[PDB]
Amino acid sequence: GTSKLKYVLQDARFFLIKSNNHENVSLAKAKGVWSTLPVNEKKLNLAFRSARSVILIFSVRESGKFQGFARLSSESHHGGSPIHWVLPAGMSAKMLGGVFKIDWICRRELPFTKSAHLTNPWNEHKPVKIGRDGQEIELECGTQLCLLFPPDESIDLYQVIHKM
RNA sequence: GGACU
Predict the structure, then answer these.
(1) Is A81 annotated as a binding residue?
(2) How far, in Å, CA of A3 to CA of A104, rounded?
(3) How far apart are CA A136 and CA A26, in angstroms?
(4) DSSP of chain A, one letter per residue?
(5) Do the annotations mark residue A20 as ligand-binding?
(6) From the Cβ of A125, is strand B under 7 Å away?
(7) Which residues contact A161 (CB under 8 A, 6 or more apart)?
(8) Strand B lies under 7 A from the Cβ of residue A19
(9) Per the structure, how many domains does chain A have?
(10) Torsions phi, psi of A131, nearest 5?
(11) Structural domain of residue A12, as residue ranges?
(12) Any idea what the CATH number is for the domain that residue A21 is in?
């Protein structure tokens, strides 16, 4: 149970991911891909090569919740077939043309009320819920946060661990 | 910095 999760969380770097809509997170859950803006895309590629795992912790903006977490399985790829993202106003397809493959670790939600005790030393010790897209979460805070999520009754950590 | 609370 936790032994497999804790294994996957070991050596990890944790990034907060924000989405302006629910639909992109749902497409991401369904297809196992994500795109972020260029600045974070660069930070994520770099992180991928420095840690056994990079964990993306998803939160839809103004939702009052996290919607789950995933592990990067690839660096971003460009020049492939574009994802049908819902593009917030002023944002172009080109800005989210970097496509990362991800393997979901937990598709279950976690209301911010359940993480209120966790603060992030890498964001001025603000509660972990507060953070821009791509904000890195310190090791202890990130690990403990992921551990708060309800167990995902439908993901078998065999393949995820297999890949690593 | 063009998907913080």
Answers:
(1) no
(2) 17
(3) 22
(4) -HHHHHHHHTTEEEEEEEES-HHHHHHHHHH-EE---HHHHHHHHHHHTTSSEEEEEEEETTSSEE-EEEEE-S--B-SSPPP-----TT--TGGG--BEEEEEEE---EEGGGGTT-EEGGGTTEETT---TT-EE-HHHHHHHHHHSPP-TT--HHHHHHH-
(5) yes
(6) no
(7) A4, A7, A8
(8) yes
(9) 1
(10) 170, 140
(11) 1-164
(12) 3.10.590.10
User: Are A12 and A54 within 8 A, CB to CB?
Assistant: yes
Q: How was this structure determined?
A: X-ray
Deposited resolution, Å = 1.8
Tell which residues of chain A come right before a gap with C–N over 2.5 A: none
Nucleotide closest to A19 measured between CA and C1'? B3
Nucleic acid strand B within 7 Å of A98 CB: no
Neighbours of A3 (CB within 10 A): 8
